[PDB]
Write a protein that binds this ligand. Sequence first.
Ligand SMILES: C=C[C@H]1CN2CC[C@H]1C[C@@H]2[C@@H](O)c1ccnc2ccc(OC)cc12
Ligand SMILES: *[C@@H]1O[C@H](CO)[C@@H](O)[C@H](O)[C@H]1NC(C)=O
Ligand SMILES: *[C@@H]1O[C@H](CO)[C@@H](O)[C@H](O)[C@H]1NC(C)=O
Ligand SMILES: *[C@@H]1O[C@H](CO)[C@@H](O)[C@H](O)[C@H]1NC(C)=O
Ligand SMILES: *[C@@H]1O[C@H](CO)[C@@H](O)[C@H](O)[C@H]1NC(C)=O
Ligand SMILES: *[C@@H]1O[C@H](CO)[C@@H](O)[C@H](O)[C@H]1NC(C)=O
Ligand SMILES: *[C@@H]1O[C@H](CO)[C@@H](O)[C@H](O)[C@H]1NC(C)=O
Ligand SMILES: *[C@@H]1O[C@H](CO)[C@@H](O)[C@H](O)[C@H]1NC(C)=O
Ligand SMILES: *[C@@H]1O[C@H](CO)[C@@H](O)[C@H](O)[C@H]1NC(C)=O
Ligand SMILES: *[C@@H]1O[C@H](CO)[C@@H](O)[C@H](O)[C@H]1NC(C)=O
Length: 1151
Amino acid sequence: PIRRAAVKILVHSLFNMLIMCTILTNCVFMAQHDPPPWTKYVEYTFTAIYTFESLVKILARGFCLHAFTFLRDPWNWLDFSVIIMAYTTEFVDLGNVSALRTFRVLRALKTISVISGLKTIVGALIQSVKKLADVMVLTVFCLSVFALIGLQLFMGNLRHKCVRNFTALNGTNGSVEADGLVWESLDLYLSDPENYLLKNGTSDVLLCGNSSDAGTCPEGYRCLKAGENPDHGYTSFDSFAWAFLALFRLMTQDCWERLYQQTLRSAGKIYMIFFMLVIFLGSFYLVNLILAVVAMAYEEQNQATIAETEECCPLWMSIKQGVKLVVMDPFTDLTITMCIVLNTLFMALEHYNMTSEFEEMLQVGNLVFTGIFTAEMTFKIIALDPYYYFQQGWNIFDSIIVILSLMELGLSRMSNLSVLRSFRLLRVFKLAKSWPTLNTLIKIIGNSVGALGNLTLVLAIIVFIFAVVGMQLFGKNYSELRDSDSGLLPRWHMMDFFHAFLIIFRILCGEWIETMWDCMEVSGQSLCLLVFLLVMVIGNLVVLNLFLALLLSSFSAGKVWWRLRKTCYHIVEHSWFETFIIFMILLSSGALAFEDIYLEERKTIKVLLEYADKMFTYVFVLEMLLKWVAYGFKKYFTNAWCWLDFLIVDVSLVSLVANTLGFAEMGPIKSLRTLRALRPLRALSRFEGMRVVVNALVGAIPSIMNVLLVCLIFWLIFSIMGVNLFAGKFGRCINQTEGDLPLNYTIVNNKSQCESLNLTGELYWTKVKVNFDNVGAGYLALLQVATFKGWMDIMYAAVDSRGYEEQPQWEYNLYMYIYFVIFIIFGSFFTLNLFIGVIIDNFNQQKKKLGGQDIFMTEEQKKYYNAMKKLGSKKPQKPIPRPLNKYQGFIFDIVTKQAFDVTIMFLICLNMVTMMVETDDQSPEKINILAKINLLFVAIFTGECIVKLAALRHYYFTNSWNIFDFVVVILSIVGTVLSDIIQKYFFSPTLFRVIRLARIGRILRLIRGAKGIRTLLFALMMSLPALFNIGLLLFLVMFIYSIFGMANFAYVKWEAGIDDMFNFQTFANSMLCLFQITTSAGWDGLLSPILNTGPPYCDPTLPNSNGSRGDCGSPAVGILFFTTYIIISFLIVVNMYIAIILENFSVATEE
Ligand SMILES: C=C[C@H]1CN2CC[C@H]1C[C@@H]2[C@@H](O)c1ccnc2ccc(OC)cc12
Ligand SMILES: *[C@@H]1O[C@H](CO)[C@@H](O)[C@H](O)[C@H]1NC(C)=O
Ligand SMILES: *[C@@H]1O[C@H](CO)[C@@H](O)[C@H](O)[C@H]1NC(C)=O
Ligand SMILES: *[C@@H]1O[C@H](CO)[C@@H](O)[C@H](O)[C@H]1NC(C)=O
Ligand SMILES: *[C@@H]1O[C@H](CO)[C@@H](O)[C@H](O)[C@H]1NC(C)=O
Ligand SMILES: *[C@@H]1O[C@H](CO)[C@@H](O)[C@H](O)[C@H]1NC(C)=O
Ligand SMILES: *[C@@H]1O[C@H](CO)[C@@H](O)[C@H](O)[C@H]1NC(C)=O
Ligand SMILES: *[C@@H]1O[C@H](CO)[C@@H](O)[C@H](O)[C@H]1NC(C)=O
Ligand SMILES: *[C@@H]1O[C@H](CO)[C@@H](O)[C@H](O)[C@H]1NC(C)=O
Ligand SMILES: *[C@@H]1O[C@H](CO)[C@@H](O)[C@H](O)[C@H]1NC(C)=O
């Protein structure tokens, strides 16, 4: 009949191309927010084509009882759902919320079954998510335990406002409050935002606390616990639903600097030990354990797929011969390859305000280089036939560069897109032939756009699907809700398609929570919670699996003098000598932590460090002099540790001689005695473990220099492009009293209008501090944009662009967002990819050079691993319990059952649930019942404890979990009984808490029985020594930068990032700033006051107690400080990853 004819229609490639064109056109139509009534045509034609497509399918593959074909296929259920949805929506609507249309988008998802083997990529992603399966349950377990720690420590401990003083006024029945105006009731007084403190600069609310460590109220306001909440209401640490969210954003490190720059301000500064626990065990470990299992899963399935796949004539001749002979000269190769270096150095010289004849010489330069390159093209075309010249990797690229640089330049009188200057700028890639590392960065991009080119297309589909789902759902809600006062939407709304795309792009970048707040403020918590977690899990799974795909695809491809020498060698061999030396180095290093801004008033102890310093110098000088003739110059100067000690002793001696003898305080002697912060590095050679760590990092130095040169020469492209696009355009005229807001563009148009109207000295024309003016200044902007910290003020200054030197305007240059999108996709992403891919290979071949293959490992810890691996490998043979008596002999008949063990195991989860239900400011009804059932559970567990003790005499204390069980029992006993002694004591908002935390020791009995948690947690218990060893070096580097910063960065102005409690004024306050920068979190705000100068934003000639004047930090050391601390921290934090993945692979491939 025609069924054989419908099968003939179904198998066309033209039919699949037609369905592709229809799906893509409907994708273009569904991504408009405001459809006009011309959609009577197109929507009916789409639902006609989608009718015709499904009819062709069901005529071939139907009849009635199809459980075998067309409906056991899962991708056709969506196609059937779409057409039945269109047919059930085109008669009559039932609920007119008009959110019905979104399911229509499921049209855009149908193209996964239509294009190619994209149907296999989604199956592989589902295989990897299925493969995780234990990391997820331990993630929710550790987030549960740490959330309960955060409750029993921090309950209600984050609502603290710094309210104004009041009085009960003794004149009414009730609670009248006096603020200089009458106020009714205490409760209504504490609820009005007329009594609170705005922080300086911002518009947050100030937080305080009764503790001695915490933030302090000013001279007239009171620190007490009464208000709404912080951020918008979504950041309190009570109410375990919110504690799980707060510790989850803690785990993915989104804006957590703001979480604990609000926690430590209220709870006291001693609680950064909790954040040092969760950042170094929750975030850095659980995040770096997801990646290991995903990478091992990908490598396993890729290995399986590879394994399964494996199973006229005279003039022409004379002129041609000579030119050809010239062309293959390896010396003429050199004078062009080293000539493009001159061009890219000549274009990286075009700065911000050229001096009107400098620009002419630069144009003449570009013209000369263009002539040199075109002459080369002509000589190589004459050199050999143009069909032979247009062959292979490198001549058509050079032809395209010449014909683009030539044609646009020939359009001499031009409108100018500014791109044309760029057209020449693309030529930097030409030296990838010689350079063996830009070859690999070209291979990564070519591997992403066409050997892994479908997996980026799945990502382009998924980003588009979420940007349409969000635009259809959340789009109308933003409209009148947004504040205006002009007609003015926010920066990160979702009404358009483009803003809807950027807000998904941010969640891919890792910044998701300030959009959840702006979304929950209009759309309710339920939808907005769901969408922005699905985007985060699905999108980061896709982006991460793409990242690992690229990385794997890349790196997959006088005879008493002799006795006098020996007796002096005998004293440095004598162990008490270096035992004295270690304690002397530690004391000499820690003693200079007292150098702070309180050493002027601490006048007494100030001299005690002078004597100490001038004693330590003499001891170390005697040390070097005593080691000299004990070892000889040959053994001493060829050790490369003794050069470090010799350099430090030399610095101390120069400082000493200049200080004592020459009255040498004259000039840069102060800048030389700043350099005595390097004294901790004497310990770097003596603790054997940090010697092992610095050997492992010194060995992998030369690769880092290569990849950093590649990243420098590759960001040079975008820096010259950013100078070409945005030089001078970041110039803002500012009303001074309001501080930090750009002026209206309708009353001040140009800089002429700004500097023309200071009849009063108010208006200041300031640059954004991180501008693109120089090529060197543009590199720091690229560093802030690439590290995902600080880019807001860069993008908002770029998008606001309007001219050359004239006021910015709210969205006058909107589409410049795609420039930073291109930079984050190319620069950050592929840079990081190449960077991790280089380091992994370097550490792998460094392991492939040694003996004992464990790196980051001292010898004694290598002896420890061999005994620690004997503990739990391969399941031990076990003895079986036997009765002894008739009395207790029938008890273990009830106890040793498998039903009793799971009875305890699901009874203790109920004991967890009764811990989860706690709240702040509950009711007195609840504490009584909850405290009664508190003792009830303890009674049950103590009962079964004593039963199992008396049931087995020596067989109790064997399993080493059962010891832990009795320990948790006696901890629960003390935690219940002590509670009654608190009343006759000192202040206890927090002493009872640290006693109450011992009930969480019950929760750690759930891991007895979960093999997916015991295995993967013993993988860290086996990984503690290398983690400890890297940690020493991390603390040491933290210590050295703390002293340099405390020497340099004290007495800066306080603003964006440097408040009264996170500053470089003492050692305790400096450790906290460097701890938040150790995770790269928020270093943008510390640098922003350091880059100041004369007015505004700072003030020189400031009265200063330390004998140093000024209040303005210096940008030269301020940039250097942060920009080398980030890289050093990154490296180490990249070591940690290598140690974790080594111990994971060893346990996994072991059993
Ligand atoms: C959970 C950790 C992942 C998140 N970032 C990318 C991969 C890892 C590590 C890194 C981050 O932890 C990090 C640590 C230390 N220094 C960094 C410096 C820059 C950076 O770019 C966002 C991330 C850094
Ligand atoms: C309240 O006012 C009365 C006088 O009207 C005075 O005697 C009393 O001491 C006051 N009490 C307080 C607590 O102010
Ligand atoms: C307050 O005092 C007045 C007397 O003027 C009385 O009528 C009223 O009941 C009192 N308030 C309360 C809550 O009892
Ligand atoms: C505000 O109350 C506090 C009590 O903590 C007190 O120390 C302070 O002196 C009061 N301020 C004024 C202006 O009375
Ligand atoms: C601090 O203590 C005072 C009295 O000891 C109390 O009235 C106040 O509410 C407390 N504030 C906080 C934040 O605990
Ligand atoms: C700067 O701000 C102050 C206070 O808002 C205002 O009075 C002044 O007019 C502003 N300057 C100019 C030039 O308008
Ligand atoms: C600046 O803009 C104003 C328009 O308000 C115009 O009159 C003036 O000529 C411009 N000056 C410069 C230097 O661009
Ligand atoms: C405005 O004029 C005052 C004159 O006192 C000057 O201090 C300030 O630098 C000027 N600002 C600009 C942008 O011209
Ligand atoms: C600047 O002022 C005008 C007043 O005519 C206002 O309409 C405009 O919205 C303001 N600019 C911005 C970016 O709000
Ligand atoms: C906040 O501003 C006030 C007044 O401008 C100042 O006295 C104080 O030192 C500032 N800094 C704080 C509270 O950290």
